[PDB]
Amino acid sequence: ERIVLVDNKCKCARITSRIIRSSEDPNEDIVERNIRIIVPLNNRENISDPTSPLRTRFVYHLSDLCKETCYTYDRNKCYTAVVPLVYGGETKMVETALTPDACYPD
Amino acid sequence: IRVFAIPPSFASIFLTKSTKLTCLVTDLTTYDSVTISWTRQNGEAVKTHTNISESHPNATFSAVGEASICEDDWNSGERFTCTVTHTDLPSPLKQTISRPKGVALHRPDVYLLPPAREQLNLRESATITCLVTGFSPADVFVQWMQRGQPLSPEKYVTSAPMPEPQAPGRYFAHSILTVSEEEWNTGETYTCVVAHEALPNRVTERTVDKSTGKPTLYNVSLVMSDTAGTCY
Amino acid sequence: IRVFAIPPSFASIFLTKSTKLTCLVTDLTTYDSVTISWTRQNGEAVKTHTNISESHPNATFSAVGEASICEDDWNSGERFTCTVTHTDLPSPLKQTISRPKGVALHRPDVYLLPPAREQLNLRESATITCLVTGFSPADVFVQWMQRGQPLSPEKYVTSAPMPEPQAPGRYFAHSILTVSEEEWNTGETYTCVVAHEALPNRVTERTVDKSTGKPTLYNVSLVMSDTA
Amino acid sequence: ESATITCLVTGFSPADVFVQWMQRGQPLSPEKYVTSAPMPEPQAPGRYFAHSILT
Amino acid sequence: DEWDCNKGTNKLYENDICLPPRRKHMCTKQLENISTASITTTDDLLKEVLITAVNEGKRLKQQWEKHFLCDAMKYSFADLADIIRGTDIWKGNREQQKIQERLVKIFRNIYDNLEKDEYEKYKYGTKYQNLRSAWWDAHRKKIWNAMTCSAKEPPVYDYVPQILRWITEWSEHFCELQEKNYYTCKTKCEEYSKFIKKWNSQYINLEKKFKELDENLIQFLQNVKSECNEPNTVDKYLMYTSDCRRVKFSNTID
Numbered sequence A: 001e002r003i004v005l006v007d008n009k010c011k012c013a014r015i016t017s018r019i020i021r022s023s024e025d026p027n028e029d030i031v032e033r034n035i036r037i038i039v040p041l042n043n044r045e046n047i048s049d050p051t052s053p054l055r056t057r058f059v060y061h062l063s064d065l066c067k068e069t070c071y072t073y074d075r076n077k078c079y080t081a082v083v084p085l086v087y088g089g090e091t092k093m094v095e096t097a098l099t100p101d102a103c104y105p106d
Numbered sequence B: 001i002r003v004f005a006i007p008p009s010f011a012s013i014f015l016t017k018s019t020k021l022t023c024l025v026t027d028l029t030t031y032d033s034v035t036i037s038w039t040r041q042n043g044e045a046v047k048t049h050t051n052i053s054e055s056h057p058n059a060t061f062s063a064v065g066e067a068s069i070c071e072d073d074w075n076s077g078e079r080f081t082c083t084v085t086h087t088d089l090p091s092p093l094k095q096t097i098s099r100p101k102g103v104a105l106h107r108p109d110v111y112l113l114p115p116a117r118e119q120l121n122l123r124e125s126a127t128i129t130c131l132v133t134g135f136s137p138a139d140v141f142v143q144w145m146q147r148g149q150p151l152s153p154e155k156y157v158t159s160a161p162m163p164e165p166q167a168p169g170r171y172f173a174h175s176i177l178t179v180s181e182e183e184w185n186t187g188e189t190y191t192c193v194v195a196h197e198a199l200p201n202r203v204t205e206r207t208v209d210k211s212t213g214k215p216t217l218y219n220v221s222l223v224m225s226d227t228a229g230t231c232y
Numbered sequence C: 001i002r003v004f005a006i007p008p009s010f011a012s013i014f015l016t017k018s019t020k021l022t023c024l025v026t027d028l029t030t031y032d033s034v035t036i037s038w039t040r041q042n043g044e045a046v047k048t049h050t051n052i053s054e055s056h057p058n059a060t061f062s063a064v065g066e067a068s069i070c071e072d073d074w075n076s077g078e079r080f081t082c083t084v085t086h087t088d089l090p091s092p093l094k095q096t097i098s099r100p101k102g103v104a105l106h107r108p109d110v111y112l113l114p115p116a117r118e119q120l121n122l123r124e125s126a127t128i129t130c131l132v133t134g135f136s137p138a139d140v141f142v143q144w145m146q147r148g149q150p151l152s153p154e155k156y157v158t159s160a161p162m163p164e165p166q167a168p169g170r171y172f173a174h175s176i177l178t179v180s181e182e183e184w185n186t187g188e189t190y191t192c193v194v195a196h197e198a199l200p201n202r203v204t205e206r207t208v209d210k211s212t213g214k215p216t217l218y219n220v221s222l223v224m225s226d227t228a
Numbered sequence D: 001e002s003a004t005i006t007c008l009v010t011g012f013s014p015a016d017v018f019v020q021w022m023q024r025g026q027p028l029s030p031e032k033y034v035t036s037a038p039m040p041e042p043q044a045p046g047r048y049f050a051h052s053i054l055t
Numbered sequence E: 001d002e003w004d005c006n007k008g009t010n011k012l013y014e015n016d017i018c019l020p021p022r023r024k025h026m027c028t029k030q031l032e033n034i035s036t037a038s039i040t041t042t043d044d045l046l047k048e049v050l051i052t053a054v055n056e057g058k059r060l061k062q063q064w065e066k067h068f069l070c071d072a073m074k075y076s077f078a079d080l081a082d083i084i085r086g087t088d089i090w091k092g093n094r095e096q097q098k099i100q101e102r103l104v105k106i107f108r109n110i111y112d113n114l115e116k117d118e119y120e121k122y123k124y125g126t127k128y129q130n131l132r133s134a135w136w137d138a139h140r141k142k143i144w145n146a147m148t149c150s151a152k153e154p155p156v157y158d159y160v161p162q163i164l165r166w167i168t169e170w171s172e173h174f175c176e177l178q179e180k181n182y183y184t185c186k187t188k189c190e191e192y193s194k195f196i197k198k199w200n201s202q203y204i205n206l207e208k209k210f211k212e213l214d215e216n217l218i219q220f221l222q223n224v225k226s227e228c229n230e231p232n233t234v235d236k237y238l239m240y241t242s243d244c245r246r247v248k249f250s251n252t253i254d
Ligand SMILES: *[C@@H]1O[C@H](CO)[C@@H](O[C@@H]2O[C@H](CO)[C@@H](O)[C@H](O)[C@H]2NC(C)=O)[C@H](O)[C@H]1NC(C)=O
Pocket: A046, A047, A048, A049, A068, A069
């Protein structure tokens, strides 16, 4: 009975809105502006690059979300980083899988 | 006389792309009359010894051979074997290298374990493990780099794979790094890379730091603003 | 013809609770009049080979003997004599074993490590590792106990002592055990007993639990507002 | 000023125990800890107990 | 006659299984109120287990008088066997944690007071359940004889894993109650609609975990697959004594 107004999956906000009606009486309807947010507590500033410090501040200006940088992964979008591998004097850079649990072919 | 044969390494094909492979004989007298014939079910050998390491601290002998064989041919599992042509040896020993068809393949679930609380309290060098669980029986090459800087392999040691106690098929391994206490105190992050098959690009990376090494402070500053807003 | 004798190590002494000696003959098939005996360096026959082992068909004779009474004398380092005599050989063959001397006795320093959070999240199985390190002699026996009973040797796996690069005389090792996720979420205790020569008590225990690793503070500052 | 850490052994029948205090793997001097002799349990028939304190 | 199949605290592990009512409200107070100080030998431990068996037998006898009694008593003996053996599922209950916390004292004392030719055999294990099962199998014959005093041969369902046995009580109970259900029609009709929906999803939730055909559970499943000519069946065909596989279970009212 609710419609998801904002569903930013890289911020995990899940703002909905519902109409719960008082029974057998005139209209004193109260409006639910539900909000649900799941903070990482262990993800970094770079969502992909792993050599960044942790992100503590969780600024949610909902004006921007209602109408850059973000902190929550998305399962369908695969992320990638490149590391240097050395077998000796030479080196070769090969990209990795930051989320290989859902990135291998299926 | 110590004799050993090394199949091509999984990190040699992926990185160098030149399928070097040889069988080695060491701790024996040098004669400089060795050309190891290789059998592809046929007697011909594509290449003889080049850059052979005759020099030894004990004046012993070594043999180096190289070739180039198709990857699909190795996947088929032909019984490539090397025959030594040393004049000292009266009977040429037969040493066969071939990976059998149907070997198990699985991806390494790499977890990185932070150092103990007790070791840091004692105020000496810490130790960080890089567990590798469930990977396929093929030998895996792992190395350690910090903030993208490849460290030298002199100060970390890796353990040969052993059968897993719970699963008779899969394997496991370990690797430890000894670093100064003040370095881990400063909070520098460290990374572990695995190089094994059954992965999208055959390389996986994990990392932690002091702020993620089983910490005690969760300094969260959840600062939601403009809650009312306008939306449709 | 050749006879090989190997002395017991600390693991054998600790597990078997007795001293067992081997004076083993190789490349010798079954013949008659085969004499094996372990005698004191002073000369007396301390123990005979009662219940002699049957000869292996592939030219191998075990001929093991027990110096169970003299536990401390082996640790003293006194030399033992094995007397191998056969009709064909004119001069009796002798095997000599003794405890080595001069090696250092640095103590181990075990550090038991709890499983990672990533492994716990997948809810499959946790692996507790026991990073024994620092011992100068290369002999360590590690068992795992849960509520005062040694776990079966199938569940854990011990790696051989590997040389440590930072210091020449020291070594290290490790072992793992596959605890179920349910039995670790229940919060049970697991112990890693290490047996080594250099320990004054010759044994050390450590404990880990679900409560071993927990954060202390949760300072949260909810700063809800309406005007930017 | 001081602290008194105790060590409550209990439940043992054969009446002989050895209690020793180790700090950082090095045994403490015997002048610090004072061990009490085994005394029978109140509510147990044939199992003793003991104590040990450290200053 | 409710099974309380919701998670709650009925079973700790996340998979859904429906606990039988016979497991709930048992007279386990005899083992619950044990004194590990006063008991340190095998002979004293047997007597209290026999007493508990007698109490269970008279409890079932009184409960029924408020062959079927024999079946319920059979599965109750199997349940008590699982309780003594230490492989029980109901860890969530706060009362049943104490019993499995204070039988450890008794069997640790027994293992401490053992002799060498058995010490080396029973040295290795976990939570002393190997010699616990050995003690049960040594004293299994006497316990059922004390139990059967109220109102032969030793039962065999005690070796059966508990989940399949729970399926068997479910089958017996449901066939019994559907026989109880029926033997104008507008008055009776609406209760049958509520009779189906109170247990409608009770069948489907367990069927999703019948796949992957515990450590000891799989070996029994593999062995029974070799026999009975029905390796993979959602219905066991053991003591069903009625039609099965959704034939008359759902929407039989119309
Ligand atoms: C930290 O974040 C920045 C952006 O906020 C990222 O920089 C680029 O990210 C894209 C994303 O795929 C990469 O393709 C580019 O290669 C990144 N730039 C560079 C110079 O590498 C990146 O995630 C982080 N920054 C850096 C320098 O890695």
